[PDB]
């Protein structure tokens, strides 16, 4: 029966993301994706009536760190793309960690829980790249990086968001499972080709 298993099994779509992030020396992102994969998978396993006996912690914990992990995964994907130098790199990481924690803990189902991170990270990226385009007097991330990484990564990102927050009204079992695959692919595409601060 698909209802129980498909959203639980599609949660393993982030395991390629953990693998690829590890291979490119993005270890802090690979932690956040693995943490997310665990809490997203066990949130779906704990919800499915036929394997709800499995979960070792309460629904409140798994539900919180499913949502928190997802929103933080979106933040560290876009901060990896922003490619900051230190001391801003760790400051911007800590900013997402602390603001997503307080917001999600206030209301995990409220507005701004995913659009706050995505909107703020987009504004940070846009300001950095427009400053760099004035310095370069030219398109800053190479047209290769736009056509291969940013364009496809934001297409799978936008597809994931409209699967979850529009099309999921029609169906859950298949649409939510496609959201996992689209968001995992979005994280893979938005992540740079190697961590320039570790290799």
């Amino acid at each position, epitope marked *: 029966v698909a209802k129980l298993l498909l959203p639980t099994l599609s949660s393993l779509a982030f395991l390629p993301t953990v693998s690829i992030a590890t291979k490119r020396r993005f270890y802090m992102e690979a932690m956040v994706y693995l943490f997310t994969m665990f809490f997203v998978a066990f949130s779906h396993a704990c919800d499915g009536p036929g394997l709800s006996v499995l979960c070792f912690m309460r629904r409140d914990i798994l539900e919180y760190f499913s949502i928190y992990g997802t929103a933080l995964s979106m933040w560290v994907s876009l901060m990896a793309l922003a490619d900051f130098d230190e001391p801003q790199r760790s400051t911007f990481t800590m900013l997402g960690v602390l603001t997503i924690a307080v917001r999600t803990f206030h209301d995990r189902w409220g507005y701004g829980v995913y659009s706050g991170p995505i909107g703020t990270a987009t504004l940070i990226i846009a300001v950095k790249w427009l400053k760099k385009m004035k310095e370069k*007097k*030219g*398109l800053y991330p190479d047209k290769s990086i736009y056509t291969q990484q940013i364009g496809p990564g934001l297409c799978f990102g936008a597809l994931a968001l409209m699967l979850r927050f529009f099309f999921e009204e029609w169906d859950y079992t298949y649409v939510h499972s496609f959201y996992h695959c689209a968001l995992a692919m979005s994280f893979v595409l938005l992540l740079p080709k190697v961590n320039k601060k570790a290799g």
Partner: antibody
Amino acid sequence: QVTLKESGPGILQPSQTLSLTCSFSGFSLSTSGMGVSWIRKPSGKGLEWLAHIFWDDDKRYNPSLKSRLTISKDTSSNQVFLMITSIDTADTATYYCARRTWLLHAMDYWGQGTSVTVSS
Amino acid sequence: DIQMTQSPSSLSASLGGKVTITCKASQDINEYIAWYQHKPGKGPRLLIHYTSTLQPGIPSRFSGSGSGRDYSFSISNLEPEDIATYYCLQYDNLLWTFGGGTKLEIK
């Protein structure tokens, strides 16, 4: 098709001004994100960048020559001019005019280049 | 400025052969390296930009690689039309700097 073509004196004696001209077609330098640049190959030596001039009327010069270079424009004529002041015999070079764009920041078309020989 | 260091000043190779030119920058140029082919009595052609991207219409034997401070450029299935001088350009800063060049010869 894009073209650039250089013009110059060919021969001058030292301690005066070298007034290089570049004429171009297939683009306008007042087009958004468009640039023209000067490079020279000195006599028996590798390439040396001299000057930039841009669509937004911005300019750059090589710090080694920033004191004696001056670059200027004429979009009406589809032309750029480079003035090099106080000629030395070290300025014996072929001078090239090259077009840079917004999407690739490196130059994508060069002119054939003009040979300038300078001695007494 | 940034100093660009093409390792072979000149290189002799057989027709149908393979050639590799290496360049070291004194400071990292963030893959903003381009490779130009120059011939006596002609303006240089852009072959490759941003380390690896071939310019459209450029025969696919030309390849380039590197990221950080060390880059390389290669010609494969070498034609007699490849006998030319090859220059790398650092264009990370608008303070442009070329390499010393590599004069390719027949064998």
